[PDB]
C-alpha cells in the first residue's frame, strides 16, 4: 500500500521569467502588460473631443472662412494636415498658451461682442477683405474679427468697451495690421502715426504699426498680429485706436477645464468611451502597465518599453 504526494501538471505552454531562470513553463499565468488599443479616438468622461478637421486652433478660433466650426469637449484633435489657420500672415502671440487653455472646456458659447450692425458708425466695416483669406473664390476675412478701414478720407479715434455680463470668462481676440508701405497706411487708415490701446482691469497693452516690406506670405508683404485675453465676469475691456485695429466681432463665453491636451492624429473619431486616450487609439484595461504610446490623456497605465510582463500564478509545468 502506498501514499504519494504530488502536484498538478497540464497542457500549458506559457513561459515566464524569474530572476534565477528564463523561459520557465508554468501551468497558469497572467499578463500585466496592456498591449492592445482599439484604433479609435473616443470620448473621455463620456464627452467627445473637438475635432477641427482640416483646420488648426488658430483657424477655428479666428474664424478662417474654411472653418465654420459643440459647447463642450474633453480634448482637441487636429490632423497632421490641418493647414487652414492664420490666412493673413503674422504672429499669433502666446499661441501655444491659448491652445492649452482651449484644450478642454465645460461651456463654450460664441457671441457677437461688438455687433457689426451698430458698433462702428464712424468707420468702414465692409472693405476689410483680402485674397489671402478667400471664400468661394472671392476676397474675404476672418468671421470673428472685423478689419476696420477709414471712410471718406477720415479715421476718427475710436473708443469701444465691453462689459462681461456672461456669468463666466470671455475670450476676446483682436488683430493689429501692419501695412507694407506708408502709402498703404494712409490709404487704409488716413493717419500716418497711429496707435491701438486695449485695457481691462487686468490687461493693458499699447500697439504701434510696424510698417515695412516683409517677404510675401500668401502674397502679402504686410502683416497682421493676433492677440487675445480672458476677461473676467463683471470686468470691462476697452479698445482705443487711431488706425490699424482689427476689432473683435465674435468673442467666446467659456468655462475652462483643468488639465487636458491636444491630439494630432489621423486616427478616426468614434462613439465609444475610454478612460485613457492615445494618438493611435484608446486603451481600456485594468492592467498597471502599457507599451502602446508614451503620450496619453486620461487615467492610464504607466508606459514601459517592455514587450512581455507575465506574472506566474501556477507552478512550473512538468508533464514528463
Amino acid at each position: 500500500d502506498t501514499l504519494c504526494i504530488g502536484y498538478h501538471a497540464n497542457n500549458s505552454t506559457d513561459t515566464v521569467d524569474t530572476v534565477l531562470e528564463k523561459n520557465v513553463t508554468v501551468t497558469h499565468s497572467v499578463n500585466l502588460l496592456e498591449d492592445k488599443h482599439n484604433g479609435k479616438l473616443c470620448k473621455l468622461r463620456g464627452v467627445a473631443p473637438l475635432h477641427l478637421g482640416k483646420c488648426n486652433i488658430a483657424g477655428w478660433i479666428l474664424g478662417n472662412p474654411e472653418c465654420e466650426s459643440a459647447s463642450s469637449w474633453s480634448y482637441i484633435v487636429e490632423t497632421p494636415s490641418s493647414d487652414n489657420g492664420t490666412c493673413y500672415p503674422g504672429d499669433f502671440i502666446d499661441y501655444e498658451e491659448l491652445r492649452e487653455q482651449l484644450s478642454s472646456v465645460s461651456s463654450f458659447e460664441r457671441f457677437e461682442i461688438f455687433p457689426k450692425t451698430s458698433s462702428w458708425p464712424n468707420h468702414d466695416s465692409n472693405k476689410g477683405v483680402t485674397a489671402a483669406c478667400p471664400h468661394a473664390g472671392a476676397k474675404s476675412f476672418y468671421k470673428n474679427l472685423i478689419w476696420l478701414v477709414k471712410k471718406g478720407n477720415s479715421y476718427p479715434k475710436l473708443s469701444k468697451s465691453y462689459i462681461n455680463d456672461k456669468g463666466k470668462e470671455v475670450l476676446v481676440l483682436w488683430g493689429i495690421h501692419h501695412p507694407s508701405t506708408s502709402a498703404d497706411q494712409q490709404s487704409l487708415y488716413q493717419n500716418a502715426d497711429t496707435y491701438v490701446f486695449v485695457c481691462s482691469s487686468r490687461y493693458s497693452k499699447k500697439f504701434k504699426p510696424e510698417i515695412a516690406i516683409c517677404p510675401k506670405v500668401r502674397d502679402q508683404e504686410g502683416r497682421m498680429n493676433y492677440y487675445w485675453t480672458l476677461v473676467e465676469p463683471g470686468d470691462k475691456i476697452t479698445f482705443e485706436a487711431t488706425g490699424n485695429l482689427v476689432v473683435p466681432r465674435y468673442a467666446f463665453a467659456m468655462e475652462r477645464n483643468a488639465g487636458s491636451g491636444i491630439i494630432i492624429s489621423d486616427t478616426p473619431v468614434h462613439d465609444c468611451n475610454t478612460t485613457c486616450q492615445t494618438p493611435k487609439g484608446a486603451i481600456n484595461t485594468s492592467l498597471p502597465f502599457q507599451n502602446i504610446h508614451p503620450i496619453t490623456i486620461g487615467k492610464c497605465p504607466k508606459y514601459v518599453k517592455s514587450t512581455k510582463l507575465r506574472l506566474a500564478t501556477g507552478l512550473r509545468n512538468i508533464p514528463s
Binding site: 502506498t2 504519494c4 504530488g6 508614451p294
Partner: protein, 171 residues
C-alpha cells in the same frame, strides 16, 4: 527550488490530477487514484489571487495629459519635458521588469513550499509505520485501506493502532 520538492525529490507533475494544484495518489486493496488536497489548493488560489490583485489594484494613477506643445524658442523646457517622460519611462520599465522576475521566483517557491509542507505532514504522522520509497512516495509497512488513507489526509492518523503490525514487516 527553494524547498526542494517541486522539480526536486518529486521529479514531475501529474496530469492525472486535473482535480487541483496539490494532492495525493494512493493505492491499496480497495483501489487507487488521484485526489487533490482541497484545503491547501483552495488556500493557494485565494492567496495567489490576492497577490495578483495587489500588483494590479495598487497602481491607481493620476489623470494626466502627457503631451505638451512648445514653440521654436522653447527648446529648453521642451527638453526638460522630454527628460521627465523619459525618466518616468526608465523608472517604470526597470521596476516593472524586476517586479515580475522577483515575484515569479517567489510564486514558484510558494508552490514548492506548499508541496513540501504536505509531504512533511504525512512523513511526520507515519514515522515508523511506512518507509520513504523516494519521489515523494510512502510505502506502508502495514495494510492501509481507505478509512486509513483518508485519516492521513486529515492529520488524524493513529500511529499506535498499527505500530505493532508495522514492526513485523521490517524483516
Amino acid at each position: 527550488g527553494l524547498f526542494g520538492a517541486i522539480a526536486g525529490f518529486i521529479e514531475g507533475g501529474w496530469t492525472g490530477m486535473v482535480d487541483g494544484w496539490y494532492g495525493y495518489h494512493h493505492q491499496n486493496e480497495q483501489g487507487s487514484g488521484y485526489a487533490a488536497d482541497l484545503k491547501s489548493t483552495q488556500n493557494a488560489i485565494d492567496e495567489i489571487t490576492n497577490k495578483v490583485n495587489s500588483v494590479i489594484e495598487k497602481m491607481n494613477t493620476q489623470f494626466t495629459a502627457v503631451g505638451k506643445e512648445f514653440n521654436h524658442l522653447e527648446k529648453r523646457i521642451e527638453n526638460l519635458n522630454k527628460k521627465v517622460d523619459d525618466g518616468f519611462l526608465d523608472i517604470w520599465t526597470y521596476n516593472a521588469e524586476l517586479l515580475v522576475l522577483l515575484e515569479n521566483e517567489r510564486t514558484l517557491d510558494y508552490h514548492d513550499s506548499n508541496v513540501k509542507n504536505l509531504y512533511e505532514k504525512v512523513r511526520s504522522q507515519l514515522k515508523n509505520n511506512a518507509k520513504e520509497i523516494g519521489n515523494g512516495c510512502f510505502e506502508f509497512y502495514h495494510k492501509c485501506d481507505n478509512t486509513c488513507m483518508e485519516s492521513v489526509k486529515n492529520g488524524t492518523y493513529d500511529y499506535p493502532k498499527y505500530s505493532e503490525e508495522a514492526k513485523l514487516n521490517r524483516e
